[PDB]
Amino acid sequence: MRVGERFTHDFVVPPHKTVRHLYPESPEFAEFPEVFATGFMVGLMEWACVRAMAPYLEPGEGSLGTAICVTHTAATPPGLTVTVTAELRSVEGRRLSWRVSAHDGVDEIGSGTHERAVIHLEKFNAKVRQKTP
Amino acid sequence: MRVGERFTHDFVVPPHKTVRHLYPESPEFAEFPEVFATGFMVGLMEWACVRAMAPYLEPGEGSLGTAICVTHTAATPPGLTVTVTAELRSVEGRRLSWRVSAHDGVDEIGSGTHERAVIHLEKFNAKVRQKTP
């Protein structure tokens, strides 16, 4: 896991990763064309980076996404394979950053950056509990 | 539309908007803390801007998100209300650019920018259906 190393992750888009499935609560999204939602592309890019960094975590640790800055440049219907490529840009202590890019086999669909922070899972969950109603 | 006009969108986070629910097929995400996923925060920011834009589109139009560039700085358990504030920066042809931020009643959880493109829904759906395997 050196800076400049590339990690790849492939995912066939199923029908339930389209826009209306991200927020079934949204009448505003209900009838939208059946294309892979930006929020699901983001979650796939983050999933690629989590798989790339798993060797860096010590027992008890996990990670949070702290920033996402990407374009979404072409649309993908269900059935195509989205390949995400995660290129490690920086690792320093708790902070990691990648350049991410995604292609659906037909078009480049988007690219940009993603940053993560390593967390201590138990300490983090206790903080979460204190702001839980 | 009025540049500098702020729109607010409030959303109580239900249990099914945590990280594990974004990708039930990800074993990695299945063990994550039960906090609002960045992919769901991105979709909520899109939803805010879609509601702001709606009165101003013509019949048969909608929009797509073309870029998002946000931080995600604090974590939110189910049961808090996330309020997205969306402020229009510019309208150029079919392109609309926004400043977005979100807060969960306890902490600011993220901020940055978002761009959208107005589409003709039927024309775009027919073009989508043609790259479908």
Side-chain angles (χ1 to χ4, degrees), chain A residues 1 3-91 93 96-133, chain B residues 1-128 130-133:
Chain A
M1 197 188 143
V3 167
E5 276 176 11
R6 291 156 86 93
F7 173 85
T8 304
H9 175 83
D10 308 313
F11 180 73
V12 180
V13 177
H16 51 92
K17 296 302 184 191
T18 62
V19 175
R20 68 184 62 180
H21 292 267
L22 193 77
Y23 278 90
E25 301 92 353
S26 176
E28 290 80 31
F29 288 150
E31 318 285 2
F32 196 75
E34 291 276 62
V35 302
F36 191 43
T38 308
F40 287 129
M41 184 185 73
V42 167
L44 184 72
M45 286 171 160
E46 300 185 353
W47 185 9
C49 290
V50 163
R51 284 179 70 191
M53 65 169 286
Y56 194 73
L57 295 173
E58 294 296 339
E61 286 181 337
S63 74
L64 303 165
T66 57
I68 186 75
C69 184
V70 295
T71 55
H72 198 172
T73 56
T76 300
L80 292 183
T81 300
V82 177
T83 294
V84 173
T85 302
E87 175 179 323
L88 186 63
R89 283 252 150 123
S90 76
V91 180
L96 292 94
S97 186
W98 286 262
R99 170 146 156 84
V100 293
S101 60
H103 185 105
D104 64 12
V106 172
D107 295 305
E108 291 290 353
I109 62 166
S111 72
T113 53
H114 180 221
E115 281 85 56
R116 307 193 65 73
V118 171
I119 50 164
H120 178 104
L121 286 173
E122 311 97 305
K123 204 286 271 299
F124 176 73
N125 292 328
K127 299 207 171 308
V128 173
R129 292 195 219 101
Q130 53 199 3
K131 57 181 291 191
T132 304
Chain B
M1 293 201 71
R2 191 173 51 82
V3 166
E5 187 166 354
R6 295 173 283 174
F7 170 68
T8 66
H9 180 254
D10 302 317
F11 179 73
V12 176
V13 176
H16 54 276
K17 300 296 185 193
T18 60
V19 172
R20 64 183 184 96
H21 289 273
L22 187 77
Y23 276 90
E25 56 269 81
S26 165
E28 287 81 10
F29 284 0
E31 62 183 327
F32 262 56
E34 282 275 73
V35 297
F36 189 53
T38 305
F40 285 125
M41 182 184 74
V42 169
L44 187 74
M45 287 172 163
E46 293 199 68
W47 187 3
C49 297
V50 168
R51 285 181 63 203
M53 277 174 73
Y56 295 95
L57 292 197
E58 305 303 330
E61 285 184 335
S63 67
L64 297 167
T66 60
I68 183 84
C69 188
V70 293
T71 58
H72 193 2
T73 56
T76 301
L80 294 180
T81 300
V82 176
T83 291
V84 170
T85 299
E87 188 169 350
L88 184 67
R89 293 180 74 192
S90 66
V91 177
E92 287 147 355
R94 77 189 307 196
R95 183 180 160 95
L96 292 78
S97 293
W98 304 86
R99 177 122 170 72
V100 291
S101 59
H103 90 248
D104 59 17
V106 177
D107 295 309
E108 153 97 68
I109 61 164
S111 65
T113 52
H114 181 228
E115 289 76 47
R116 305 197 62 72
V118 180
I119 53 162
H120 181 299
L121 290 166
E122 291 180 356
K123 180 174 75 195
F124 171 82
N125 285 331
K127 286 186 200 168
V128 167
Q130 295 162 331
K131 87 193 257 203
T132 304

PDB file of all heavy atoms in Angstrom, chain B residues 71-83:
ATOM      1  N   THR B  71     -17.276  18.128   2.526  1.00  0.00           N
ATOM      2  CA  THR B  71     -16.763  17.424   3.690  1.00  0.00           C
ATOM      3  C   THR B  71     -17.864  16.642   4.432  1.00  0.00           C
ATOM      4  O   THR B  71     -19.065  16.862   4.212  1.00  0.00           O
ATOM      5  CB  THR B  71     -16.240  18.414   4.683  1.00  0.00           C
ATOM      6  OG1 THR B  71     -17.280  19.349   5.060  1.00  0.00           O
ATOM      7  CG2 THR B  71     -15.055  19.260   4.052  1.00  0.00           C
ATOM      8  N   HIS B  72     -17.442  15.703   5.322  1.00  0.00           N
ATOM      9  CA  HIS B  72     -18.432  15.015   6.151  1.00  0.00           C
ATOM     10  C   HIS B  72     -17.676  14.906   7.471  1.00  0.00           C
ATOM     11  O   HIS B  72     -16.806  14.002   7.643  1.00  0.00           O
ATOM     12  CB  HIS B  72     -18.796  13.681   5.522  1.00  0.00           C
ATOM     13  CG  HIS B  72     -20.020  13.030   6.103  1.00  0.00           C
ATOM     14  ND1 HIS B  72     -20.831  13.568   7.102  1.00  0.00           N
ATOM     15  CD2 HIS B  72     -20.579  11.863   5.751  1.00  0.00           C
ATOM     16  CE1 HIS B  72     -21.825  12.700   7.356  1.00  0.00           C
ATOM     17  NE2 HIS B  72     -21.666  11.658   6.546  1.00  0.00           N
ATOM     18  N   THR B  73     -18.013  15.823   8.365  1.00  0.00           N
ATOM     19  CA  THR B  73     -17.103  16.236   9.544  1.00  0.00           C
ATOM     20  C   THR B  73     -17.606  15.722  10.891  1.00  0.00           C
ATOM     21  O   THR B  73     -16.888  15.848  11.889  1.00  0.00           O
ATOM     22  CB  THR B  73     -17.044  17.788   9.579  1.00  0.00           C
ATOM     23  OG1 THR B  73     -18.376  18.316   9.659  1.00  0.00           O
ATOM     24  CG2 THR B  73     -16.419  18.318   8.326  1.00  0.00           C
ATOM     25  N   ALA B  74     -18.840  15.283  10.968  1.00  0.00           N
ATOM     26  CA  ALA B  74     -19.386  14.738  12.245  1.00  0.00           C
ATOM     27  C   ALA B  74     -20.409  13.672  11.863  1.00  0.00           C
ATOM     28  O   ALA B  74     -20.986  13.717  10.764  1.00  0.00           O
ATOM     29  CB  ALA B  74     -20.086  15.883  13.097  1.00  0.00           C
ATOM     30  N   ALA B  75     -20.598  12.693  12.759  1.00  0.00           N
ATOM     31  CA  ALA B  75     -21.435  11.532  12.503  1.00  0.00           C
ATOM     32  C   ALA B  75     -22.826  11.675  13.156  1.00  0.00           C
ATOM     33  O   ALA B  75     -22.953  12.286  14.214  1.00  0.00           O
ATOM     34  CB  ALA B  75     -20.778  10.264  13.100  1.00  0.00           C
ATOM     35  N   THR B  76     -23.818  11.062  12.484  1.00  0.00           N
ATOM     36  CA  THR B  76     -25.196  11.280  12.903  1.00  0.00           C
ATOM     37  C   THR B  76     -25.914   9.931  13.026  1.00  0.00           C
ATOM     38  O   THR B  76     -26.083   9.231  12.095  1.00  0.00           O
ATOM     39  CB  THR B  76     -25.961  12.099  11.801  1.00  0.00           C
ATOM     40  OG1 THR B  76     -25.342  13.358  11.572  1.00  0.00           O
ATOM     41  CG2 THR B  76     -27.439  12.374  12.174  1.00  0.00           C
ATOM     42  N   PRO B  77     -26.371   9.610  14.285  1.00  0.00           N
ATOM     43  CA  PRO B  77     -27.206   8.412  14.489  1.00  0.00           C
ATOM     44  C   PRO B  77     -28.618   8.620  14.010  1.00  0.00           C
ATOM     45  O   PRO B  77     -29.087   9.774  13.950  1.00  0.00           O
ATOM     46  CB  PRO B  77     -27.159   8.292  16.034  1.00  0.00           C
ATOM     47  CG  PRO B  77     -27.085   9.704  16.552  1.00  0.00           C
ATOM     48  CD  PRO B  77     -26.166  10.410  15.480  1.00  0.00           C
ATOM     49  N   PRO B  78     -29.305   7.518  13.727  1.00  0.00           N
ATOM     50  CA  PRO B  78     -30.783   7.626  13.468  1.00  0.00           C
ATOM     51  C   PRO B  78     -31.494   8.386  14.602  1.00  0.00           C
ATOM     52  O   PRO B  78     -31.175   8.327  15.772  1.00  0.00           O
ATOM     53  CB  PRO B  78     -31.235   6.186  13.421  1.00  0.00           C
ATOM     54  CG  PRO B  78     -29.958   5.378  13.023  1.00  0.00           C
ATOM     55  CD  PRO B  78     -28.840   6.110  13.754  1.00  0.00           C
ATOM     56  N   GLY B  79     -32.462   9.183  14.189  1.00  0.00           N
ATOM     57  CA  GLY B  79     -33.367   9.848  15.107  1.00  0.00           C
ATOM     58  C   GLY B  79     -33.132  11.346  15.161  1.00  0.00           C
ATOM     59  O   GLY B  79     -34.051  12.119  15.552  1.00  0.00           O
ATOM     60  N   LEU B  80     -31.917  11.816  14.840  1.00  0.00           N
ATOM     61  CA  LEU B  80     -31.711  13.267  14.685  1.00  0.00           C
ATOM     62  C   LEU B  80     -32.279  13.794  13.360  1.00  0.00           C
ATOM     63  O   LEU B  80     -32.428  13.022  12.397  1.00  0.00           O
ATOM     64  CB  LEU B  80     -30.180  13.646  14.729  1.00  0.00           C
ATOM     65  CG  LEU B  80     -29.550  13.395  16.083  1.00  0.00           C
ATOM     66  CD1 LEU B  80     -28.123  13.769  16.089  1.00  0.00           C
ATOM     67  CD2 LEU B  80     -30.215  14.118  17.227  1.00  0.00           C
ATOM     68  N   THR B  81     -32.556  15.107  13.325  1.00  0.00           N
ATOM     69  CA  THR B  81     -33.005  15.730  12.048  1.00  0.00           C
ATOM     70  C   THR B  81     -31.771  16.331  11.382  1.00  0.00           C
ATOM     71  O   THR B  81     -31.112  17.227  11.972  1.00  0.00           O
ATOM     72  CB  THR B  81     -33.972  16.869  12.368  1.00  0.00           C
ATOM     73  OG1 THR B  81     -35.109  16.273  13.091  1.00  0.00           O
ATOM     74  CG2 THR B  81     -34.540  17.506  11.125  1.00  0.00           C
ATOM     75  N   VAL B  82     -31.543  15.917  10.141  1.00  0.00           N
ATOM     76  CA  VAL B  82     -30.512  16.570   9.323  1.00  0.00           C
ATOM     77  C   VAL B  82     -31.222  17.647   8.492  1.00  0.00           C
ATOM     78  O   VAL B  82     -32.259  17.388   7.763  1.00  0.00           O
ATOM     79  CB  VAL B  82     -29.888  15.584   8.359  1.00  0.00           C
ATOM     80  CG1 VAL B  82     -28.858  16.360   7.427  1.00  0.00           C
ATOM     81  CG2 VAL B  82     -29.048  14.586   9.153  1.00  0.00           C
ATOM     82  N   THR B  83     -30.703  18.889   8.641  1.00  0.00           N
ATOM     83  CA  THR B  83     -31.248  19.991   7.860  1.00  0.00           C
ATOM     84  C   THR B  83     -30.164  20.348   6.823  1.00  0.00           C
ATOM     85  O   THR B  83     -29.029  20.634   7.221  1.00  0.00           O
ATOM     86  CB  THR B  83     -31.455  21.203   8.699  1.00  0.00           C
ATOM     87  OG1 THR B  83     -32.544  20.953   9.647  1.00  0.00           O
ATOM     88  CG2 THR B  83     -31.879  22.417   7.871  1.00  0.00           C
TER      89      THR B  83
END
